[PDB]
Structure formats: structure tokens, C-alpha cells
Specification:
The complex is a heterodimer.
Chain A lengths: L26 H8 L15
Chain B lengths: L36 H9 L5 H11 L1
Helix pairs in contact in B: 1-2
Classes of the chains: A mainly alpha, B mainly alpha.
């Protein structure tokens, strides 16, 4: 259906099933990995946004 | 070769016969011609490079 149109916000990166490889990578595989990179809650700290 | 701002005023300017052609020079190189794709992903994880530039380099190495 029409959904959010061009107006309402959406958090589009809902996640799939890719996780971090334990070793070396192809340059082709690296293109897919760039999309999954982020911070937020990935490490404990007293800092805030 | 980029010139002065459009709002510049030519107080004590150079000669009008196009003398002193030695300006507009670029800075020294600060790049490496070959890297690992692991190194590209490490640069992005470190916040030292954009995903845009990282992808661009990987498309040249695949």
C-alpha cells in the first residue's frame, strides 16, 4: 500500500543475517560489510549524544 | 588554477601583462596507491574514512 509516502520518517536498517567474519575478506565482500558498520551501544561509556 | 575571491579589490596588484605565472600550486600527495580490503574496513571502523570513499577504493581493487 501507500505506506509513509515521501513524508514520515523510517529507520530503514532493520537488519538481515550478516555478521562480522573471523579472518580476511574479499574486496567484493567488503562492499556488503560497509552497510552493517555502526556505533551507538557497541561499547560501554559515560559519554552521551 | 583557482584565483582570488570575486569580492577582492586589486590594491597594490601585480602587472597587467600577466606577469609572475607561479601561483595556484597544489599541496603534496597524502595517499597510498595499494591497500588491503581489511585495511579499508578498519579505516571506516576507526572513523578515519567515509563509507563513500571506502566503497570507491574497494571497487578499484575487486
Amino acid at each position: 500500500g501507500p505506506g509513509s509516502y515521501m513524508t514520515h520518517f523510517e529507520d530503514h536498517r532493520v537488519g538481515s543475517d550478516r555478521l562480522a567474519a573471523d579472518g580476511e575478506i574479499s574486496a567484493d565482500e567488503a562492499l556488503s560489510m560497509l552497510d552493517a558498520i555502526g556505533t551507538g551501544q557497541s561499547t560501554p561509556t559515560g559519554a552521551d549524544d | 588554477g583557482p584565483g582570488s575571491p570575486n569580492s577582492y579589490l586589486p590594491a597594490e596588484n601585480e602587472d597587467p601583462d600577466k606577469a609572475v605565472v607561479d601561483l595556484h600550486r597544489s599541496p603534496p600527495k597524502t595517499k597510498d596507491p595499494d591497500l588491503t580490503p581489511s585495511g579499508i574496513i578498519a579505516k571506516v571502523k576507526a572513523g578515519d574514512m567515509t563509507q563513500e570513499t571506502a566503497r570507491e577504493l574497494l571497487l578499484a581493487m575487486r
